[PDB]
Amino acid sequence: ATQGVFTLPANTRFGVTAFANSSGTQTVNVLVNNETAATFSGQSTNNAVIGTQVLNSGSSGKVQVQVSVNGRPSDLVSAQVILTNELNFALVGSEDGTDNDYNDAVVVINWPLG
Amino acid sequence: ATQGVFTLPANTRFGVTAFANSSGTQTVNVLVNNETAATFSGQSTNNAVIGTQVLNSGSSGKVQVQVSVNGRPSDLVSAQVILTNELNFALVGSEDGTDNDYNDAVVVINWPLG
Amino acid sequence: ATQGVFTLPANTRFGVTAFANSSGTQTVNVLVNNETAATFSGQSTNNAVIGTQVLNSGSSGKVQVQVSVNGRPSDLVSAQVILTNELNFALVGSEDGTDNDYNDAVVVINWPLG
Amino acid sequence: ATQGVFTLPANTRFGVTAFANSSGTQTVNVLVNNETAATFSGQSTNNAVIGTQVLNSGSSGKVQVQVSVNGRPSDLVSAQVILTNELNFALVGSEDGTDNDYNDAVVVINWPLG
Numbered sequence A, B, C, D: 001a002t003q004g005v006f007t008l009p010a011n012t013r014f015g016v017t018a019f020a021n022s023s024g025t026q027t028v029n030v031l032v033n034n035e036t037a038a039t040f041s042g043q044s045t046n047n048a049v050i051g052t053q054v055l056n057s058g059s060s061g062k063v064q065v066q067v068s069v070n071g072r073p074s075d076l077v078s079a080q081v082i083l084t085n086e087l088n089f090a091l092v093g094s095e096d097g098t099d100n101d102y103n104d105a106v107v108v109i110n111w112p113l114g
C-alpha cells in the first residue's frame, strides 16, 4: 500500500518536522501538489530535529513525504490520527537498513495551526 | 478519562517535542515516574518548536504530560499509535481557551530512538 | 474535550458496530445531524456484537455516539484513524463504572463502504 | 513494511471482527502463534460482519491477519491505536483489486475484554 501521502484540507497551513535516528544522513522531501515545497537533511542517532517548516497545502491539499539516504529511497510507514475531531497528525517513519526500527527519519505533520 | 499519561517500555529513551499555537505563553511539563523531567515554554501562533529533548522512561515507564497557561491547567486530549508493530507515537493536544482547536500546545513523544 | 463526535464526508455511507463488555446493559445511540439514527442495546461480558448497521452521514456529515448504562451516560474516549489515506476508522470506548477499562461498550465506525 | 501482525499481551482474550466490502468473496484467517485460530468467509458490498469471535492470544501473544479472495492474497494495511492508555484497537484493511479503497475486508481486533 502507498504510504506517506496525505490529503489535507485545501489552502491550509500545516507544520512539518523531521527527526533522525540512523548512522546515515537523512534527506526528507515534502511535496505539495506533486512539487517540492521543503527539504531537510541531517544525521543523528539521538532524535535530533533535522528540520521544521510551515507550509500551505494549496488548492489540492495533497502532501507527500519522501525519504532517501545517500540517494537510496527508504521504505515508509504512515498513518493519520485525529483527536477530538479537530487536531490532526500525519505520521511517517522510514527504514534505510535491515533492522526494521522504521525510525531512521521520523516525520510529523500537524494541523491546524494558529 | 485521564489524558496525557502513557506507559512506555521501561528504561527506554524517548523523544519529546512541543509546538505552540496560541496567543498565550505555553508551559509544558513532562513527568517521568511522577517527577518533572523536562519543562518547555514559549509563545507562537506559527507552530514554533518550543522544546525538544531526549529522556529515559525509567524503571516504571510512566510518562505524563501536563500543560498550563498563566498558571491554569489546559484541557488535554491524547492517544498512542503504533505503526508496523514497532514504531510508537504518543500524541497530546491541549486547549487554553474557548475555540476548541486543541493545538495551543501540541506534544509528540516518539520511540524507539537510535 | 468532547468525545464520540466525528465529521464524516457529506452524504457518505458508513458502518457502525457496537460490542459489550460489562455486567450492565449497554444502550448505544448513533446520531446523524443531531438526531438519533440508530439505537443498539444488549448485555455481554464476552464482546458480543450488540448491533451493526449501515447509515448515511447526510448533508452535514456530523455523527455522534452516545452510550448509557443503568440510566446514566458513560464516559467516552475516542479517536479517528486513517490508513493509506483511504480507510477511515472512528473508534469509541466507554466506561460505565469504576475500573476504567473503557470497554463496557466499544463502538467502531468505518468508511467508505462498498 | 510488514502489515497485519500484532503483539498482544500473553494469555489475554481479544475480539476479532471482519467486514466485507467487495464483489469478491473474502476469506479472512486469524493466526495465533502462527496457527489458524479463526476463519471467516463471505461476500458483501454493504459492510456485513462476515464473522466475529473471541480468541486467546496464548503464550506468544502473536496475532496475524491474512486475507485472500479465492486463494489470491490481498494487500494489507494496518495500525494499532491505544485510548486512555488502556483500550487497544488493532486495525486492518485489505485490497483485492485496483481501486485502492482498502475496505474489501476490514478487520478489527480489540482488547481487553470483559
Ligand SMILES: C[C@@H]1O[C@@H](O)[C@@H](O)[C@H](O)[C@@H]1O
Pocket (backbone or CB within 6 Å): A021, A022, A023, A024, A045, A095, A096, A097, A098, A099, A100, A101, A102, A104, B114
Ligand atoms: C545506527 C543504525 O543506523 C542504521 O543502520 C539504521 O537503519 C539503524 O536503525 C540504526 O539507527
Ligand SMILES: C[C@@H]1O[C@@H](O)[C@@H](O)[C@H](O)[C@@H]1O
Pocket (backbone or CB within 6 Å): A114, B021, B022, B023, B024, B045, B095, B096, B097, B098, B099, B100, B101, B104
Ligand atoms: C490566537 C488564539 O490564542 C488563543 O485564544 C488560543 O486558544 C486560540 O486557539 C488561538 O490560537
Ligand SMILES: C[C@@H]1O[C@@H](O)[C@@H](O)[C@H](O)[C@@H]1O
Pocket (backbone or CB within 6 Å): C021, C022, C023, C024, C045, C095, C096, C097, C098, C099, C100, C101, C104, D114
Ligand atoms: C463485569 C464488569 O461490569 C462492569 O462493572 C464494568 O464496568 C466492568 O468493566 C466489568 O466489565
Ligand SMILES: C[C@@H]1O[C@@H](O)[C@@H](O)[C@H](O)[C@@H]1O
Pocket (backbone or CB within 6 Å): C114, D021, D022, D023, D024, D045, D095, D096, D097, D098, D099, D100, D101, D104
Ligand atoms: C465492488 C468492487 O469490488 C472489488 O472490485 C473491490 O476491490 C472494489 O473496491 C469494489 O468494492
Ligand SMILES: [Ca+2]
Pocket (backbone or CB within 6 Å): A022, A095, A096, A097, A098, A099, A100, A101, A102, A103, A104
Ligand atoms: Ca533502521
Ligand SMILES: [Ca+2]
Pocket (backbone or CB within 6 Å): A021, A022, A101, A102, A103, A104, B113, B114
Ligand atoms: Ca534507526
Ligand SMILES: [Ca+2]
Pocket (backbone or CB within 6 Å): B022, B095, B096, B097, B098, B099, B100, B101, B102, B103, B104
Ligand atoms: Ca485554542
Ligand SMILES: [Ca+2]
Pocket (backbone or CB within 6 Å): A113, A114, B021, B022, B101, B102, B103, B104
Ligand atoms: Ca490555537
Ligand SMILES: [Ca+2]
Pocket (backbone or CB within 6 Å): C022, C095, C096, C097, C098, C099, C100, C101, C102, C103, C104
Ligand atoms: Ca468498566
Ligand SMILES: [Ca+2]
Pocket (backbone or CB within 6 Å): C021, C022, C101, C102, C103, C104, D113, D114
Ligand atoms: Ca468492562
Ligand SMILES: [Ca+2]
Pocket (backbone or CB within 6 Å): D022, D095, D096, D097, D098, D099, D100, D101, D102, D103, D104
Ligand atoms: Ca478495493
Ligand SMILES: [Ca+2]
Pocket (backbone or CB within 6 Å): C113, C114, D021, D022, D101, D102, D103, D104
Ligand atoms: Ca471495496
